[PDB]
């Protein structure tokens, strides 16, 4: 069976925060933040706009791009680490707000790698024959869990959502290959502090792990598709660090003009990261039907995923 | 392909809390709690025992019962609304403590219904031919989110975990039929209050939903499996309210001695509820190879699940 992306949409909130903003509360600079991360601005949800609101905005665009009606959706999976509540889930709230039938809806947690975990989950369902139009969202409001007193993390993170309908697509298109994994030995390097409610990171260890796993997962998922570097039209890594993305690109062996970079405008958006990058490449006319794209990400867990997708219905 | 339960384990923590315990800080009695719920006691985890510890103990029992090795597990899925942290996940921590390879691991939120959601998730992965031994955990520490100042809810909830290995089983065994649903319009009737971090319930609306869905959904999957009342060996609903369980039982037209009752010793334990009842029926010798069991449940979301399963590997 050919299972792919029948429609796509992405949303970042209105409020844009520049690097210079942090200088009034923290010992940081534009020059420091830019050099180290490649981030120039990030988007932050308003106080009354939660993860579910970002998810909603991305999903309605996905459904219009898919040319289906809400009643066509036969399951909702939201990848988020920052759901409004553990119950009801962002997935539940979208069932109500999108006005779908009373279909199965759940949040899946794999941090930064969640969007890829959920798309793969959706694929398994569609391949059974029982599901035709599965809404997969990657949404994080990371601004809720950012320690604004820590210069090392306060500057990293922003908010957004992406969404795809996973269903049947035409011959040769869709999800060709995927790789998922985890390594709980790295949990202590990137976690949500149980007391403060804030993201805690051993940056140097996350860096070293990100460089290796991003390199490994992307080359492996290309080999599994029986493709080489030369067959890839776009490399779309999870957007967190320009150095990490560069290192992964070098391992894979593809040219810089072939790597999607949106970290400069969104910072890191966890599950929303890859979709916000895809949105940029669609609108700039760098991604079209029949292009072969490689996604890769790592996350707190530690988690990782990678997929080879041929673009189009 | 026949996909079912290769191995089963369950775990309730040591500390038993009787109905009389509540009298020292609430206006409750044994008879008041017993007439309302059918609850006599519940198990609460120690302060140094989180959802992952409960999940770990159910999982090792599940592995030994499956007669496999940790290196055989190709995916960990944990159904929980009370994971230690959103990242790393309970699934991530199990990847490490169980000593598995670096396999896909994720937590799935469908509240109360999560265990049923996640076994169905596991089934989709096995039916593809790429996964053979998927660990599925239903684990909640509801003690952590119980409002001990609200007599209505303080007495309802306890802690536990169940675990199955989902994989190939012999001719005619395993998951025969299922249904999974959600209705986000009921989100306001059962949720985690953002401010307190505690479960808030409109009891009337929840009871009305429970009664209707637990009868509609069990009946539908019995029908969907081309079976009737007499084919059912065990009815194992989510254990929470004995008047709600009896309502589902008589709507199925089934003998009292055919329903599993464990709410008397565990209270409601969310994703752990059905597995803790299965374990009691196993050790009491009420559940055997080729027995046809019916599962049904609802959760905050709202969510629901129902399945027909023929026992054994
Ligand atoms: C993703 O899993 N994630 C957010 N990203 C990071 O914490 C991160 C990105 C890049 C570097 Cl160098 C370090 C850390 C953490 C939890 C989902 C929120
Ligand atoms: C299940 O979703 N769950 C456990 N909680 C209940 O609120 C409940 C069960 C049964 C009855 Cl009759 C009433 C209430 C709620 C959230 C996952 C923890």
């Amino acid at each position: 069976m050919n299972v792919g992306i029948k429609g796509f949409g992405a949303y970042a909130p209105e409020k844009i925060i520049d690097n210079a903003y942090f200088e009034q509360f923290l010992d940081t600079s534009d020059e420091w933040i830019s050099k180290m991360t490649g981030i120039k601005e990030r988007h932050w949800a308003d106080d009354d706009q939660d993860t579910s609101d970002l998810a909603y905005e991305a999903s309605v665009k996905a459904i219009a791009d898919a040319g289906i009606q809400p009643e066509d959706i036969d399951m909702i999976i939201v990848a988020t680490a920052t759901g409004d509540m553990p119950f009801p889930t962002v997935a539940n709230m979208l069932q109500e707000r999108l006005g779908t039938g009373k279909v199965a809806s759940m949040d899946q947690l794999a941090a930064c790698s969640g969007f890829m975990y959920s798309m793969i989950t959706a694929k398994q369902y569609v391949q059974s024959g029982d599901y035709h139009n599965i809404l997969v969202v990657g949404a994080d409001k990371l601004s809720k869990i950012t320690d604004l007193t820590d210069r090392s993390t306060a500057v990293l993170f922003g908010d957004g959502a992406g969404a795809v309908i996973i269903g049947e697509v035409s011959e040769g298109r869709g999800i060709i290959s995927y790789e998922m994994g985890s390594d709980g030995t790295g949990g202590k390097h990137l976690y949500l502090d149980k007391d403060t409610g804030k993201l805690k990171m051993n940056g140097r260890e996350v860096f070293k792990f990100a460089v290796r796993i991003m390199g490994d997962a992307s080359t492996r998922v290309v080999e599994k598709a029986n493709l080489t570097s030369d067959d890839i039209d776009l490399f779309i890594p999870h957007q967190a660090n320009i150095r990490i993305m560069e290192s992964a690109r070098e391992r894979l062996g593809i040219s810089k003009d072939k790597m999607s970079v949106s970290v400069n405008k969104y910072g890191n958006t966890s599950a929303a990261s890859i979709p916000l990058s895809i949105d940029q490449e669609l609108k700039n006319g760098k991604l079209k039907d029949d292009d072969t794209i490689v996604l890769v990400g790592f996350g707190g867990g530690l988690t990782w995923g990678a997929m080879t997708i041929k673009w189009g219905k």
Side-chain angles (χ1 to χ4, degrees), chain A:
Chain A
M1 188 178 300
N2 294 301
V3 183
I5 287 157
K6 282 190 66 177
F8 168 96
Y11 175 86
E14 278 186 49
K15 190 160 74 198
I16 305 178
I17 303 300
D18 58 42
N19 284 345
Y21 169 84
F22 293 94
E23 304 184 354
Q24 74 191 300
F25 310 130
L26 302 181
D27 185 14
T28 62
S29 75
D30 200 345
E31 182 198 343
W32 177 267
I33 293 166
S34 311
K35 273 175 170 288
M36 295 319 147
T37 71
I39 309 165
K40 301 302 302 186
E41 34 190 43
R42 75 283 291 139
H43 296 231
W44 282 356
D46 311 314
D47 307 340
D48 63 358
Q49 186 185 206
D50 214 344
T51 302
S52 61
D53 296 300
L54 309 181
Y56 177 68
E57 293 305 345
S59 311
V60 295
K61 291 162 149 214
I63 299 158
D65 192 65
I68 72 170
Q69 284 288 77
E71 84 211 286
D72 295 325
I73 309 286
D74 42 15
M75 188 171 284
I76 309 181
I77 313 174
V78 175
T80 181
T82 58
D84 309 15
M85 301 169 285
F87 59 94
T89 70
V90 170
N92 295 335
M93 297 163 140
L94 285 185
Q95 185 287 145
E96 165 164 50
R97 292 188 69 179
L98 292 182
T100 63
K102 296 182 170 161
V103 303
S105 67
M106 61 176 175
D107 300 358
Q108 267 196 144
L109 320 203
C112 293
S113 312
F115 193 57
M116 284 173 297
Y117 267 67
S118 298
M119 279 196 301
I120 288 146
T121 301
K123 178 172 178 275
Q124 314 303 315
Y125 280 86
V126 173
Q127 260 163 193
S128 75
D130 293 321
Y131 301 86
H132 306 289
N133 293 276
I134 297 184
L135 174 63
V136 179
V137 177
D140 278 300
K141 190 170 156 167
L142 292 185
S143 59
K144 283 193 299 196
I145 57 167
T146 301
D147 185 350
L148 274 333
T149 72
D150 185 352
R151 70 180 170 185
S152 293
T153 64
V155 308
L156 252 14
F157 299 126
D159 305 335
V164 288
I165 307 305
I166 296 288
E168 269 208 3
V169 295
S170 60
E171 188 49 48
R173 292 188 174 167
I175 302 163
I176 317 305
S177 74
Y178 69 90
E179 186 86 355
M180 287 190 299
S182 67
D183 184 351
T185 65
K188 65 169 156 270
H189 298 318
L190 182 49
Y191 66 94
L192 205 275
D193 186 278
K194 293 191 206 185
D195 298 334
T196 76
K198 304 308 184 216
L199 186 150
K200 278 280 168 72
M201 181 179 63
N202 179 337
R204 192 158 190 87
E205 288 287 344
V206 169
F207 182 99
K208 293 172 167 187
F209 162 78
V211 161
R212 185 173 57 68
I213 197 46
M214 218 110 168
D216 290 2
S218 54
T219 63
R220 178 61 40 89
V221 98
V222 172
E223 328 214 337
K224 285 167 69 58
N226 301 132
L227 299 180
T228 62
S229 184
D230 297 324
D231 299 307
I232 312 310
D233 303 293
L234 265 183
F235 177 43
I236 318 180
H238 139 73
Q239 304 284 124
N241 196 117
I242 216 308
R243 300 185 289 155
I244 297 174
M245 293 165 52
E246 204 44 50
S247 172
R249 185 188 64 65
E250 232 275 42
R251 183 82 77 217
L252 194 63
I254 66 118
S255 52
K256 209 224 254 64
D257 69 352
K258 241 81 148 270
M259 183 167 62
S260 186
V261 180
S262 57
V263 69
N264 53 306
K265 75 175 64 142
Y266 298 127
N268 195 264
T269 53
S270 176
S273 193
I274 292 170
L276 281 171
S277 237
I278 291 179
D279 199 44
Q280 166 177 284
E281 303 310 331
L282 291 170
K283 292 169 161 147
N284 286 343
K286 297 299 195 211
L287 172 59
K288 294 162 183 334
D289 289 0
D290 292 315
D291 288 342
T292 297
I293 66 163
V294 170
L295 319 185
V296 65
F298 79 88
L302 297 161
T303 65
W304 61 92
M307 17 208 326
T308 305
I309 298 158
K310 196 159 174 207
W311 201 254
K313 303 164 170 60

